């Protein structure tokens, strides 16, 4: 699949807003993910002890992790589809070291859309959400293909 320049513009326009507060968006997204799909929390040995949203918000390590994740995702989105090089190491660590099923990538994609919808309604209307979903589907599709080449079905 391929996004048009118009769709990329919608994606990058709302992403520019997210970059005004990467740490904050990172926390909201992971808290949403962990609360909505608690099973994903078990994949993080560093955070699986967190019991409440309050503890999650107060975790300095979780906040730093969120920044690392969103920074990596932002770099991929800014490539506008030409992300082969960026995807290689990400696909290897998540398939081989962390063992993250494609299903879980769908869950975090849902969390990202939910947070952008809540925080940026004016810049995240129907068309913008469709563009973001398409960009994330492309990401998940290419990651899945790499998973297979690497020997991980998940
Ligand atoms: C938007 C998709 C995602 C991106 C861009 C992303 C990115 C990253 C990055 C850059 C790191 C640090 C470097 C590395 O280990 O490769 C990381 C670590 C990790 N990711 Fe992801 N990730 C994504 C989704 C997920 C999901 C859905 C899970 C599982 C629910 C997951 C689990 C992990 C784990 C367990 C680590 C190691 C954390 C640690 O122990 O420090 N990731 N991820």
Coordinates of N, CA and C and ligand atoms in Angstrom, one line a residue:
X1 N 0.8 -1.2 0.0 CA 0.0 0.0 0.0 C 0.9 1.3 0.0
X2 N 0.3 2.3 -0.5 CA 1.0 3.6 -0.6 C 0.1 4.8 -0.2
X3 N 0.6 5.7 0.6 CA -0.2 6.9 1.0 C 0.2 8.0 0.0
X4 N -0.8 8.9 -0.2 CA -0.6 10.0 -1.1 C 0.1 11.1 -0.3
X5 N 0.7 12.1 -0.9 CA 1.3 13.2 -0.2 C 0.3 13.9 0.7
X6 N -0.9 13.9 0.2 CA -2.0 14.6 1.0 C -2.2 13.9 2.4
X7 N -2.2 12.5 2.3 CA -2.3 11.8 3.5 C -1.1 11.9 4.5
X8 N 0.1 11.9 3.9 CA 1.3 12.1 4.7 C 1.2 13.5 5.4
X9 N 0.7 14.5 4.7 CA 0.7 15.8 5.2 C -0.2 15.9 6.5
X10 N -1.3 15.1 6.4 CA -2.3 15.1 7.5 C -1.6 14.4 8.7
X11 N -0.9 13.3 8.4 CA -0.2 12.6 9.5 C 0.9 13.4 10.1
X12 N 1.7 14.1 9.3 CA 2.8 14.9 9.8 C 2.4 16.2 10.5
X13 N 1.2 16.7 10.1 CA 0.7 17.9 10.7 C 0.3 17.6 12.2
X14 N -0.4 16.5 12.4 CA -0.8 16.2 13.8 C 0.4 15.7 14.6
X15 N 1.3 15.1 13.9 CA 2.5 14.6 14.6 C 3.3 15.8 15.1
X16 N 3.3 16.9 14.4 CA 4.0 18.1 14.8 C 3.5 18.6 16.1
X17 N 2.2 18.4 16.3 CA 1.6 18.8 17.6 C 2.0 17.9 18.7
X18 N 2.1 16.6 18.4 CA 2.6 15.6 19.4 C 4.0 16.0 19.9
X19 N 4.8 16.4 18.9 CA 6.2 16.7 19.2 C 6.4 17.9 20.2
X20 N 5.3 18.6 20.4 CA 5.4 19.8 21.3 C 5.5 19.2 22.7
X21 N 5.1 18.0 23.0 CA 5.2 17.4 24.3 C 5.3 15.8 24.1
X22 N 6.5 15.4 23.7 CA 6.7 14.0 23.5 C 6.5 13.1 24.7
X23 N 7.1 13.6 25.8 CA 7.0 12.9 27.1 C 5.6 12.7 27.5
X24 N 4.8 13.7 27.5 CA 3.4 13.7 27.9 C 2.6 12.7 27.0
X25 N 2.8 12.8 25.7 CA 2.0 11.9 24.8 C 2.4 10.5 25.1
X26 N 3.7 10.3 25.3 CA 4.2 8.9 25.6 C 3.6 8.3 26.8
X27 N 3.4 9.1 27.9 CA 2.8 8.5 29.1 C 1.3 8.2 28.8
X28 N 0.6 9.1 28.2 CA -0.8 8.9 27.9 C -1.1 7.6 27.0
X29 N -0.2 7.4 26.0 CA -0.3 6.3 25.1 C 0.0 4.9 25.8
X30 N 1.0 4.9 26.7 CA 1.3 3.6 27.3 C 0.3 3.3 28.5
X31 N -0.2 4.3 29.1 CA -1.2 4.1 30.2 C -2.4 3.6 29.5
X32 N -2.8 4.1 28.4 CA -4.0 3.7 27.7 C -3.8 2.2 27.3
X33 N -2.6 1.9 26.7 CA -2.3 0.6 26.3 C -2.4 -0.5 27.4
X34 N -1.7 -0.1 28.5 CA -1.7 -1.0 29.7 C -3.1 -1.2 30.3
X35 N -3.9 -0.1 30.3 CA -5.2 -0.2 31.0 C -6.2 -0.9 30.1
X36 N -6.1 -0.7 28.8 CA -7.0 -1.3 27.8 C -6.7 -2.8 27.5
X37 N -5.4 -3.1 27.4 CA -4.9 -4.5 27.2 C -3.8 -4.8 28.1
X38 N -4.2 -5.1 29.4 CA -3.3 -5.5 30.5 C -2.3 -6.6 30.1
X39 N -2.6 -7.5 29.2 CA -1.7 -8.5 28.8 C -0.4 -8.0 28.2
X40 N -0.5 -6.8 27.6 CA 0.7 -6.2 27.0 C 1.7 -5.8 28.1
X41 N 1.2 -5.5 29.3 CA 2.1 -5.1 30.3 C 3.1 -6.2 30.7
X42 N 2.7 -7.5 30.6 CA 3.5 -8.6 31.0 C 4.7 -8.7 30.1
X43 N 4.8 -8.1 29.0 CA 5.9 -8.1 28.1 C 7.1 -7.2 28.6
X44 N 6.8 -6.3 29.5 CA 7.8 -5.4 30.0 C 8.3 -5.8 31.4
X45 N 9.4 -6.5 31.5 CA 9.9 -6.9 32.8 C 10.2 -5.7 33.6
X46 N 10.5 -4.6 33.0 CA 10.8 -3.4 33.8 C 9.6 -2.7 34.3
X47 N 8.4 -2.9 33.8 CA 7.2 -2.3 34.2 C 6.1 -3.2 34.7
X48 N 6.2 -4.5 34.5 CA 5.1 -5.4 34.9 C 4.7 -5.3 36.4
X49 N 5.4 -4.7 37.2 CA 5.1 -4.6 38.6 C 4.1 -3.4 38.9
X50 N 4.0 -2.5 38.0 CA 3.1 -1.3 38.1 C 1.7 -1.8 38.3
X51 N 1.0 -1.4 39.4 CA -0.3 -1.9 39.7 C -1.4 -0.9 39.3
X52 N -1.2 0.4 39.4 CA -2.2 1.4 39.1 C -1.7 2.5 38.2
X53 N -2.7 3.2 37.6 CA -2.4 4.3 36.7 C -1.6 5.4 37.4
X54 N -1.8 5.5 38.7 CA -1.1 6.5 39.5 C 0.4 6.1 39.5
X55 N 0.7 4.8 39.7 CA 2.1 4.4 39.8 C 2.7 4.5 38.4
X56 N 1.9 4.3 37.3 CA 2.4 4.4 36.0 C 2.8 5.9 35.7
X57 N 1.9 6.8 36.1 CA 2.2 8.2 35.8 C 3.5 8.7 36.6
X58 N 3.7 8.1 37.8 CA 4.8 8.5 38.6 C 6.1 7.9 38.2
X59 N 6.1 6.9 37.3 CA 7.3 6.1 36.9 C 8.1 6.9 35.9
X60 N 9.3 7.3 36.4 CA 10.3 8.0 35.6 C 10.8 7.2 34.4
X61 N 11.0 5.9 34.7 CA 11.5 5.0 33.6 C 10.5 4.8 32.5
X62 N 9.2 4.8 32.9 CA 8.1 4.6 31.9 C 8.1 5.8 31.0
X63 N 8.2 7.0 31.6 CA 8.2 8.3 30.8 C 9.3 8.3 29.8
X64 N 10.5 7.9 30.3 CA 11.7 7.9 29.4 C 11.5 6.9 28.3
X65 N 10.9 5.8 28.6 CA 10.7 4.7 27.6 C 9.7 5.3 26.6
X66 N 8.7 6.0 27.0 CA 7.7 6.5 26.1 C 8.3 7.5 25.1
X67 N 9.3 8.3 25.6 CA 9.9 9.2 24.7 C 10.8 8.5 23.7
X68 N 11.4 7.4 24.1 CA 12.2 6.6 23.2 C 11.4 6.0 22.1
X69 N 10.2 5.5 22.5 CA 9.3 4.8 21.5 C 8.7 5.8 20.5
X70 N 8.2 7.0 21.0 CA 7.6 7.9 20.1 C 8.6 8.6 19.2
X71 N 9.9 8.7 19.7 CA 10.9 9.3 18.9 C 11.2 8.4 17.7
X72 N 11.3 7.1 18.0 CA 11.6 6.1 16.9 C 10.4 6.0 15.9
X73 N 9.2 6.1 16.4 CA 8.0 6.1 15.6 C 8.0 7.4 14.7
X74 N 8.3 8.5 15.3 CA 8.3 9.8 14.6 C 9.3 9.7 13.4
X75 N 10.5 9.1 13.7 CA 11.5 9.0 12.6 C 11.0 8.2 11.4
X76 N 10.3 7.2 11.7 CA 9.7 6.3 10.7 C 8.6 7.1 9.9
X77 N 7.7 7.7 10.6 CA 6.7 8.5 9.9 C 7.2 9.6 9.0
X78 N 8.3 10.2 9.5 CA 8.9 11.3 8.7 C 9.6 10.8 7.4
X79 N 9.8 9.5 7.3 CA 10.4 8.9 6.1 C 9.3 8.8 5.0
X80 N 8.1 8.9 5.4 CA 6.9 8.8 4.5 C 6.9 7.6 3.6
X81 N 7.1 6.4 4.2 CA 7.1 5.2 3.5 C 8.5 4.6 3.2
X82 N 9.5 5.4 3.1 CA 10.9 5.0 2.8 C 11.6 4.7 4.1
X83 N 11.1 3.7 4.9 CA 11.6 3.4 6.2 C 12.3 2.0 6.3
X84 N 12.7 1.4 5.2 CA 13.3 0.1 5.3 C 14.5 0.0 6.3
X85 N 15.4 1.0 6.3 CA 16.5 1.0 7.2 C 16.1 1.1 8.7
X86 N 15.2 2.0 8.9 CA 14.7 2.2 10.3 C 14.0 1.0 10.8
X87 N 13.3 0.3 10.0 CA 12.5 -0.9 10.4 C 13.3 -2.1 10.7
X88 N 14.5 -2.3 10.1 CA 15.3 -3.5 10.3 C 15.6 -3.8 11.8
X89 N 16.3 -2.9 12.5 CA 16.6 -3.1 13.9 C 15.4 -3.2 14.8
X90 N 14.4 -2.5 14.5 CA 13.2 -2.5 15.3 C 12.5 -3.9 15.2
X91 N 12.4 -4.4 13.9 CA 11.8 -5.7 13.7 C 12.6 -6.8 14.3
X92 N 13.9 -6.7 14.3 CA 14.7 -7.7 14.9 C 14.6 -7.8 16.4
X93 N 14.7 -6.7 17.1 CA 14.5 -6.7 18.6 C 13.2 -7.1 19.0
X94 N 12.1 -6.7 18.3 CA 10.8 -7.0 18.8 C 10.3 -8.4 18.4
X95 N 11.0 -9.0 17.4 CA 10.6 -10.4 17.0 C 11.5 -11.4 17.8
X96 N 12.8 -11.1 17.9 CA 13.7 -12.0 18.5 C 14.0 -11.8 20.0
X97 N 14.1 -10.6 20.5 CA 14.4 -10.3 21.9 C 13.1 -10.2 22.7
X98 N 12.2 -9.3 22.3 CA 11.0 -9.0 23.1 C 9.8 -9.9 22.8
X99 N 9.8 -10.5 21.6 CA 8.7 -11.4 21.1 C 7.4 -10.7 21.2
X100 N 7.2 -9.7 20.3 CA 5.9 -9.0 20.3 C 5.0 -9.4 19.1
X101 N 3.9 -10.0 19.4 CA 3.0 -10.4 18.3 C 2.4 -9.2 17.6
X102 N 2.1 -9.4 16.3 CA 1.5 -8.4 15.5 C 0.3 -7.8 16.1
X103 N -0.4 -8.7 16.8 CA -1.7 -8.4 17.5 C -1.4 -7.2 18.5
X104 N -0.3 -7.2 19.2 CA 0.1 -6.2 20.2 C 0.4 -4.9 19.5
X105 N 0.9 -4.9 18.2 CA 1.2 -3.7 17.5 C -0.1 -3.1 17.1
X106 N -1.1 -3.9 16.9 CA -2.4 -3.4 16.6 C -3.0 -2.6 17.8
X107 N -2.8 -3.2 19.0 CA -3.2 -2.6 20.2 C -2.6 -1.3 20.5
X108 N -1.3 -1.1 20.3 CA -0.7 0.2 20.5 C -1.1 1.2 19.5
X109 N -1.4 0.7 18.3 CA -1.9 1.6 17.2 C -3.2 2.2 17.6
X110 N -4.0 1.4 18.2 CA -5.4 1.8 18.7 C -5.2 2.9 19.8
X111 N -4.2 2.6 20.7 CA -3.9 3.5 21.8 C -3.4 4.9 21.3
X112 N -2.6 4.9 20.2 CA -2.1 6.1 19.6 C -3.3 6.9 19.0
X113 N -4.1 6.2 18.3 CA -5.3 6.9 17.7 C -6.2 7.5 18.8
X114 N -6.4 6.8 19.8 CA -7.3 7.2 20.9 C -6.7 8.5 21.6
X115 N -5.4 8.5 21.8 CA -4.8 9.7 22.5 C -4.8 10.9 21.5
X116 N -4.5 10.7 20.3 CA -4.5 11.8 19.3 C -5.9 12.4 19.2
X117 N -6.9 11.5 19.2 CA -8.3 11.9 19.1 C -8.7 12.8 20.3
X118 N -8.3 12.4 21.5 CA -8.6 13.1 22.7 C -7.9 14.4 22.8
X119 N -6.6 14.4 22.5 CA -5.8 15.6 22.6 C -5.8 16.6 21.5
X120 N -6.0 16.1 20.3 CA -6.0 17.0 19.1 C -7.2 16.9 18.2
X121 N -8.5 17.0 18.7 CA -9.7 16.9 17.9 C -9.7 17.8 16.7
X122 N -9.2 19.0 16.8 CA -9.2 20.0 15.7 C -8.3 19.6 14.6
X123 N -7.3 18.8 14.9 CA -6.3 18.4 13.9 C -6.4 16.9 13.7
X124 N -7.4 16.3 14.2 CA -7.6 14.8 14.0 C -9.0 14.5 13.7
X125 N -9.5 15.1 12.6 CA -10.9 14.8 12.2 C -10.9 13.4 11.5
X126 N -12.0 13.1 10.8 CA -12.1 11.8 10.1 C -11.0 11.6 9.1
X127 N -10.8 12.5 8.2 CA -9.8 12.4 7.2 C -8.4 12.2 7.8
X128 N -8.0 13.0 8.8 CA -6.7 12.9 9.5 C -6.6 11.5 10.2
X129 N -7.6 11.0 10.8 CA -7.6 9.7 11.5 C -7.4 8.6 10.5
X130 N -8.1 8.7 9.3 CA -7.9 7.7 8.3 C -6.5 7.7 7.8
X131 N -5.9 8.9 7.6 CA -4.5 9.0 7.1 C -3.6 8.3 8.2
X132 N -3.8 8.6 9.4 CA -2.9 8.1 10.5 C -3.1 6.5 10.6
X133 N -4.3 6.1 10.5 CA -4.6 4.6 10.5 C -3.8 4.0 9.3
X134 N -3.9 4.6 8.2 CA -3.3 4.0 7.0 C -1.7 4.0 7.2
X135 N -1.2 5.0 7.8 CA 0.3 5.1 8.0 C 0.7 4.0 9.0
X136 N -0.2 3.7 10.0 CA 0.1 2.7 11.0 C -0.1 1.3 10.4
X137 N -1.0 1.2 9.5 CA -1.3 -0.1 8.9 C -0.1 -0.5 8.0
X138 N 0.5 0.5 7.3 CA 1.7 0.4 6.5 C 2.8 -0.1 7.3
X139 N 3.0 0.6 8.5 CA 4.0 0.2 9.4 C 3.9 -1.2 9.9
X140 N 2.7 -1.6 10.3 CA 2.5 -3.0 10.8 C 2.6 -4.0 9.7
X141 N 2.3 -3.6 8.4 CA 2.4 -4.5 7.3 C 3.9 -4.8 7.0
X142 N 4.7 -3.8 7.0 CA 6.1 -3.9 6.7 C 6.8 -4.6 7.8
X143 N 6.4 -4.4 9.0 CA 7.0 -5.0 10.2 C 6.7 -6.5 10.1
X144 N 5.4 -6.8 9.8 CA 5.0 -8.2 9.7 C 5.8 -9.0 8.7
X145 N 6.1 -8.4 7.5 CA 6.9 -9.0 6.5 C 8.3 -9.2 7.0
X146 N 8.8 -8.3 7.7 CA 10.2 -8.5 8.3 C 10.2 -9.6 9.3
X147 N 9.1 -9.7 10.1 CA 9.0 -10.7 11.1 C 9.2 -12.1 10.4
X148 N 8.5 -12.3 9.3 CA 8.5 -13.6 8.6 C 9.9 -13.9 8.1
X149 N 10.6 -12.9 7.5 CA 12.0 -13.1 7.0 C 12.9 -13.4 8.2
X150 N 12.6 -12.9 9.4 CA 13.4 -13.2 10.5 C 13.1 -14.5 11.2
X151 N 12.0 -15.1 10.8 CA 11.7 -16.4 11.4 C 10.7 -16.4 12.5
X152 N 10.0 -15.2 12.7 CA 9.0 -15.1 13.7 C 7.6 -14.9 13.1
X153 N 6.7 -15.8 13.5 CA 5.3 -15.7 13.0 C 4.5 -14.8 13.7
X154 N 4.7 -14.7 15.1 CA 3.9 -13.9 15.9 C 3.3 -12.6 15.3
Ligands
LIG1 C1 4.7 1.8 17.6 C2 5.4 0.5 17.8 C3 6.5 0.4 18.6 C4 7.7 1.1 18.4 C5 8.0 2.2 17.4 C6 8.6 0.5 19.4 C7 9.8 1.0 19.7 C8 10.7 0.5 20.6 C9 12.0 1.0 20.8 C10 12.8 2.1 20.0 C11 12.6 0.3 21.9 C12 14.0 0.4 22.4 C13 15.0 -0.3 21.5 C14 14.7 -1.7 21.3 O1 14.6 -2.5 22.2 O2 14.5 -2.1 20.1 C15 11.5 -0.6 22.3 C16 11.7 -1.5 23.3 C17 10.7 -2.4 23.7 N1 9.5 -2.6 23.1 FE1 8.7 -1.5 21.6 N2 8.0 -0.5 20.2 C18 6.7 -0.6 19.6 C19 5.7 -1.4 20.1 C20 5.9 -2.3 21.2 C21 4.8 -3.1 21.7 C22 3.3 -3.1 21.2 C23 5.3 -3.9 22.7 C24 4.7 -4.9 23.4 C25 3.4 -4.7 24.0 C26 6.7 -3.5 22.8 C27 7.6 -4.0 23.7 C28 8.9 -3.6 23.9 C29 9.8 -4.1 24.9 C30 9.5 -5.2 25.9 C31 10.9 -3.3 24.8 C32 12.0 -3.4 25.8 C33 11.9 -2.3 26.9 C34 13.0 -2.4 28.0 O3 13.1 -3.4 28.6 O4 13.7 -1.4 28.1 N3 7.0 -2.5 21.8 N4 10.4 -0.5 21.5

